[PDB]
Amino acid sequence: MEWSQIFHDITTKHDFKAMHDFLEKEYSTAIVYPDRENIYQAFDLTPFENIKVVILGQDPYHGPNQAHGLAFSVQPNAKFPPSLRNMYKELADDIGCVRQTPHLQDWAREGVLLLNTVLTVRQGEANSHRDIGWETFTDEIIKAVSDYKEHVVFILWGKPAQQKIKLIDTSKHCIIKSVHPSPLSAYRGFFGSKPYSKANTYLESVGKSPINWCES
């Protein structure tokens, strides 16, 4: 299965014309994040048949030199967001390796679909592109991943990501859920949760090679 066919199947079920005109006007008038050519970077770097793990985000970062189309990831020169810092700390305490670059494109190549539920945002305006169509599209993307793959790992951090369990066939796919890695919640469930090694354990139990979460 290809991303293009799933995208077309989605376009048959929902009209995206008004959303297109809105986003075109937005990119022409204001500063929209991420860059236009990076909106679907999570899909470009993780072809559908390469999906092993799905980590859901929420909104893209809304500051300069941050978002680039992947959930949680930021550009190489960016300061580390706190959630990403705690993700790396849990990775060190879980797998044993310390990551020094703040981008996750190697995770994407390894098969980790880093999917925000909303894919664009105006600079400095949180939730500015909410309720324009991204939610429907990403819900359908989650449904398609649940349907057209045999067994994948969904890492659902936080309550909003856990609300998407209704869209996942829990009989087929592994669900790793905990509180958000945000510093506001990391010490209430995230630290010690060991999501990376659990995902790799499930992948090996289903006959798939594990994710190399470390740098290389």
């Binding site: 500051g63 300061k79 706190p82 949180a126 936080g158 309550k159 509180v179 945000s182 506001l184």
Partner: protein, 123 residues
């Protein structure tokens, strides 16, 4: 409704105005250089995952998903302090800052009984 246009002078949203107030208070309390900008991590999360269990109970926070704003830079990370704001459907829920492992509150309510209100320290 129009916090930007509800005062005498031009201002931003209630969130951004409260952010600037929290910033001028934290800069003094922690002797902050503010040589770098305050980047913001925004996230929605259940109140029971982001607030102490003692304040949840059978209050409306037992089910509420809050919009959270956590500010950060390398200086705040050095001092292990994270200023935060929390809202629930355009109403202010919390003003405070994480201090290492603690969670300090300058304002906190469950929409029915104000737990803490020390906003007098901000103005």
């Amino acid at each position: 409704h129009h916090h930007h246009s509800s005062g005498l002078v031009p201002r931003g949203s209630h969130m951004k105005t409260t952010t600037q107030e929290l910033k001028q208070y934290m800069t003094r309390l922690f002797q902050l250089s503010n040589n770098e900008t305050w980047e913001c991590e925004t996230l929605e999360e259940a109140a029971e995952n982001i607030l102490p269990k003692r304040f949840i109970n059978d209050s409306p926070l037992a089910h509420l998903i809050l919009e959270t704003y956590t500010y950060y830079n390398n200086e705040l990370h050095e001092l292990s302090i994270y200023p935060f704001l929390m809202y629930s459907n355009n109403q202010l829920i919390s003003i405070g800052y994480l201090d290492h492992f603690d969670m300090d509150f300058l304002y906190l309510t469950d929409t029915k009984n104000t737990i803490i209100d020390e906003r007098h320290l901000l103005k």
